[PDB]
Subunit: 129 residues, 2 copies
Amino acid sequence: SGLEDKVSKQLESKGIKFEYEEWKVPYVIPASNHTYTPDFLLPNGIFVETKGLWESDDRKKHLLIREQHPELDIRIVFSSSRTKLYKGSPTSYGEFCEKHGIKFADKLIPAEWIKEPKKEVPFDRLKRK
Amino acid sequence: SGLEDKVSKQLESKGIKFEYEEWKVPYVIPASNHTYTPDFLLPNGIFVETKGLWESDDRKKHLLIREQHPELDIRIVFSSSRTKLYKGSPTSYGEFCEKHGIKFADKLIPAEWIKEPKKEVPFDRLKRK
């Protein structure tokens, strides 16, 4: 940077010996608690989230929720699952979902999902509104 | 949204009783591990970070570092300590530092800091670049 150079030029001019970016300090960012509210809950126990732009954080949230709540069946309906993860990415929302076993579809809830046999939803583990 | 509207219309048209944003799924964002590399380390054991823009995440980082490594003396030299935290915020970088006990200066490292008596830095706690 320009700032680092000024400071650097300062110390040297005054003959101050110093160390630069020589040392690393470890630290941990504490685990945090959050909640996610799926857009729709179908009678057969299927949760459905609708999504246009699907940002990095949101993808991680889904991967985390699947790891933490494997008995939850949460699927996604995209305006377009072809959209690429980011600017010049080669990977698309749909591809990502396929890689992680996230069931998805475009524009509307597929007819077959609505018809899957109802399953138990662990509501005790959830918090209402 | 167009997507939430179309999907709920599709559901209503098929007679599906669905709950909308009725349930909160709790989840945890895992603790993460990092390392911070101060820009300079003076002979007397004082570390100095040079900062221009200083974002919300960078600030939060500084507080975690002070908490986890209270044995280190980490100070900040800003391009301007008058800069506001974020657009609209009334609080400046300099006021954030005073509120949290972080020593700071503007543009160049204060001569009086350079002159403070040496304090041994516990390098066993740190990791070389």
